[PDB]
Amino acid sequence: PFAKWTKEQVCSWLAEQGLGSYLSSGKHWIISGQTLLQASQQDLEKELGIKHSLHRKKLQLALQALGSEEETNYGKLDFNWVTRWLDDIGLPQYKTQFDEGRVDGRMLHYMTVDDLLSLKVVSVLHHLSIKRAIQVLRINNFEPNCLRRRPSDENSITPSEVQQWTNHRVMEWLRSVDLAEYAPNLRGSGVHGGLMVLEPRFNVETMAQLLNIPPNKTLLRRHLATHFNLLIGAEAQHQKRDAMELPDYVLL
Amino acid sequence: TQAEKDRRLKKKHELLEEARRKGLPFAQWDGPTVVAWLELWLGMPAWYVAACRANVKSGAIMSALSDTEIQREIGISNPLHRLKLRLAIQEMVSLTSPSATLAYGDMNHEWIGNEWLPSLGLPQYRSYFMECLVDARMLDHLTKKDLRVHLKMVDSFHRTSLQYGIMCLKRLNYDRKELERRREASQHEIKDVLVWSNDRVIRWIQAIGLREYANNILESGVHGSLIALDENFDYSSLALLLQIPTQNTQARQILEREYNNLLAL
């Protein structure tokens, strides 16, 4: 148990968790790993001098995690992994904030709406994009390379595959379907396979909005619909048709 | 520099032969192929090609184009340009189907303007036809308002001239090789009148002894098919055109007999 670990074994783990900035301050405050556990939520925030809120939650999560002593998979993914993952889900405009808050796999799992708002992620669409990306991690038992595998192009003759497509891959897809002029608009848009395939609220119109294809270019949208549907599959197509019958009202 | 202007033109030809010899029907041609088609076979100008390229990404789409889609999405304001496109597509859809004349640009809008229209003794309208991209296929479809408003034929007789011109191509099955071949088979003999260019008809008037008068039928719309097919068009109406005063009796009498010979043989 972490409680039996020496001051130095604790210090290096703490620093390995991207929390080495609070080191030369709380070095005298920590003799044992048990004293870390003993400390209530406030003892650490006073003594270690953790002032960023995300940083508190991070430790809190990490501690209650070692206490269960069972080995969670989302917990296996450190913060550098998550910050790479932002390139994959299509939201690299946030790497500074996430990396500075040391968002790991646990924090992804326990992600709240205010957390994301604090990291300046405010777009409804980006909350969808993140919610469905995490689903894809769940589908894949939180295996580090699940997205960071690119298989061959032809590999998509089963829609399941598309579920694991990154933002880059979707752009590569648009180019293969003669929408090269639009493919870069998806940069920073959080569009990825997980969202296209799994979110019933996400369809052709959303896609076409994000691509900057005006509502008046019927012929272009028609092309786009035809290819989008072949991409996603029959079921996913049906799922999205079905959702249209129940409008996503703002006020019940 | 120009090395890359040649390579990409080859590629465009290659896409088409790849398609017409893989047997595929039009509604299944890909974007690039359809765009090649517009340039090479339809003789479409670059500005129009670029419009279609940006708004029409498949044969599937291409084949289904409505007039208002062409009008509002493609952004083609002149109705004659629109009709041009619809008709081309109309023709290509048949031509490429499981169901057993063909235009690969043989009678496109530049032959129509620089060769055919002058051949009909109508060179004065050439530019407007060009500016409207009028090809052989469209001719059959032009209305009276088209000819007056868009193509500037205020003269009803010139419209009649065009009509008979078309009636000729119809009976020739629009076969361009056969026209030019028949036209030159009869440059110095006196047989196949249906075809004769306004030029052939001038030189003939000179050969019966009316060298002064002939030159006057230059922008008149006088040609072989009018002569051969219009029952109203007799020697009297030809003389009127040649601007022969009624006093000159002998010239009229000459034309009357030689014209009837021309009609007999």
Side-chain angles (χ1 to χ4, degrees), chain A residues 1 3 6 8 10-15 17-26 31-37 39-46 48-68 70-147 149 151-152 154-240 242-252, chain B residues 1-3 6 9 11-13 15-21 23-100 103-176 178-182 184-188 190 192-199 201-210 212-256 258-264:
Chain A
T6 174
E8 203 159 322
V10 158
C11 265
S12 84
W13 158 71
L14 201 54
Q17 299 316 303
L19 311 179
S21 62
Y22 309 113
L23 267 186
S24 76
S25 52
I31 173 163
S32 174
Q34 219 316 107
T35 64
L36 263 175
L37 270 82
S40 86
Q41 192 184 0
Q42 298 218 127
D43 285 46
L44 310 149
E45 296 161 14
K46 301 303 174 196
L48 279 179
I50 300 170
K51 272 177 178 160
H52 201 310
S53 89
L54 272 180
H55 285 188
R56 299 173 178 119
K57 189 178 184 175
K58 190 201 170 78
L59 175 56
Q60 189 212 199
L61 291 172
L63 281 195
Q64 141 208 316
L66 257 128
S68 180
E70 152 283 326
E71 174 199 274
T72 45
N73 270 343
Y74 51 66
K76 290 205 186 214
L77 305 165
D78 58 16
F79 74 96
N80 309 286
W81 183 93
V82 169
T83 143
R84 272 182 265 119
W85 170 81
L86 297 173
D87 289 320
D88 288 347
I89 81 192
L91 295 171
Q93 56 270 43
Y94 306 124
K95 311 217 283 169
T96 296
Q97 307 90 82
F98 268 65
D99 193 76
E100 184 206 343
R102 309 284 194 252
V103 181
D104 51 49
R106 297 195 210 88
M107 283 155 78
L108 282 195
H109 175 64
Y110 294 88
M111 257 296 168
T112 76
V113 175
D114 353 297
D115 277 358
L116 284 172
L117 304 190
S118 75
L119 293 148
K120 274 103 182 74
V121 198
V122 307
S123 151
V124 168
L125 228 132
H126 305 164
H127 290 214
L128 246 23
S129 172
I130 284 156
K131 130 145 143 254
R132 298 289 177 190
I134 302 181
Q135 208 190 328
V136 175
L137 302 182
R138 265 161 211 191
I139 276 171
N140 281 100
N141 309 339
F142 286 99
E143 204 271 332
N145 272 302
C146 68
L147 281 218
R149 264 186 319 289
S152 76
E154 263 185 48
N155 204 98
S156 163
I157 302 325
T158 74
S160 319
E161 298 318 70
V162 179
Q163 283 171 3
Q164 279 88 32
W165 276 20
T166 53
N167 183 250
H168 186 54
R169 182 70 187 77
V170 185
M171 304 195 284
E172 189 187 304
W173 174 65
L174 297 152
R175 285 187 264 109
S176 70
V177 121
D178 271 292
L179 302 163
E181 330 84 284
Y182 300 98
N185 299 326
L186 291 204
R187 274 179 144 99
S189 77
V191 174
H192 55 274
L195 179 72
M196 287 165 78
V197 165
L198 299 163
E199 179 56 68
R201 254 50 164 112
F202 186 100
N203 56 25
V204 155
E205 272 95 282
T206 323
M207 185 67 81
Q209 250 200 66
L210 293 171
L211 293 177
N212 286 307
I213 303 171
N216 38 292
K217 312 258 91 172
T218 304
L219 308 156
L220 281 169
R221 283 162 180 261
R222 178 135 77 238
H223 188 72
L224 177 53
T226 290
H227 279 99
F228 187 73
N229 294 324
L230 294 177
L231 182 70
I232 66 170
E235 237 269 25
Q237 213 197 322
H238 193 47
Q239 221 167 260
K240 299 187 203 270
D242 287 349
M244 220 88 76
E245 302 279 289
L246 294 147
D248 196 355
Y249 295 126
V250 142
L251 180 64
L252 300 159
Chain B
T1 78
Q2 198 218 357
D6 288 329
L9 177 78
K11 194 168 170 194
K12 279 176 187 167
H13 283 279
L15 289 168
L16 291 181
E17 196 68 320
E18 182 78 329
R20 199 198 57 125
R21 147 265 140 218
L24 295 192
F26 201 65
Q28 296 185 255
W29 288 14
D30 58 302
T33 299
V34 164
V35 170
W37 166 73
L38 286 161
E39 212 163 311
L40 309 179
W41 288 9
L42 192 45
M44 225 63 139
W47 68 261
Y48 199 154
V49 173
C52 298
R53 188 179 61 246
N55 287 280
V56 189
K57 301 276 175 176
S58 70
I61 304 277
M62 180 56 79
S63 96
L65 280 170
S66 66
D67 195 80
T68 79
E69 273 162 0
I70 298 162
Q71 213 212 281
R72 283 199 261 152
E73 291 205 47
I74 312 260
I76 302 307
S77 74
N78 154 34
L80 287 193
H81 294 159
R82 293 206 293 281
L83 180 90
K84 167 151 199 167
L85 185 50
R86 280 195 309 294
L87 287 168
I89 305 157
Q90 247 185 234
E91 196 193 40
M92 272 288 149
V93 168
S94 266
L95 204 91
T96 61
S97 39
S99 197
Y104 298 106
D106 306 57
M107 289 173 56
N108 267 170
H109 82 266
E110 30 252 296
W111 179 85
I112 292 297
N114 291 358
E115 300 216 351
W116 188 68
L117 220 53
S119 146
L120 300 188
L122 303 161
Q124 61 268 34
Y125 304 107
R126 160 203 190 281
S127 73
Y128 306 106
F129 271 62
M130 303 269 279
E131 214 272 309
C132 281
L133 311 166
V134 179
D135 51 353
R137 269 176 313 253
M138 286 161 68
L139 292 170
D140 217 320
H141 290 267
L142 317 171
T143 53
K144 194 178 82 169
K145 209 200 189 188
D146 290 334
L147 291 169
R148 276 192 307 98
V149 157
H150 301 268
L151 302 168
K152 297 281 308 169
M153 303 229 284
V154 185
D155 179 309
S156 62
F157 169 77
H158 291 136
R159 291 201 298 284
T160 306
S161 175
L162 185 66
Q163 190 35 44
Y164 281 101
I166 301 154
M167 294 181 77
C168 178
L169 319 189
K170 255 210 210 271
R171 190 184 160 154
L172 284 177
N173 199 342
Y174 292 93
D175 188 357
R176 197 193 139 174
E178 274 274 317
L179 196 170
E180 294 169 4
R181 195 198 52 79
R182 278 169 65 165
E184 215 217 296
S186 54
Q187 291 299 325
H188 309 93
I190 181 147
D192 200 329
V193 192
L194 177 48
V195 171
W196 289 27
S197 61
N198 181 257
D199 210 287
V201 178
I202 294 162
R203 268 149 38 240
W204 169 77
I205 288 165
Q206 289 162 349
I208 62 157
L210 333 196
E212 51 174 344
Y213 283 138
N215 256 25
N216 313 263
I217 66 151
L218 278 176
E219 304 191 331
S220 63
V222 165
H223 63 259
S225 317
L226 186 69
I227 290 163
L229 286 184
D230 188 348
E231 288 299 69
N232 298 315
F233 209 79
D234 47 16
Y235 101 84
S236 313
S237 56
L238 176 50
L240 165 87
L241 282 157
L242 282 145
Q243 277 183 1
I244 293 165
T246 79
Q247 294 131 314
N248 189 347
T249 171
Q250 82 174 198
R252 283 224 204 284
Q253 184 227 58
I254 288 167
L255 177 73
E256 179 194 53
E258 299 283 81
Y259 189 87
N260 280 17
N261 170 75
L262 176 66
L263 213 56

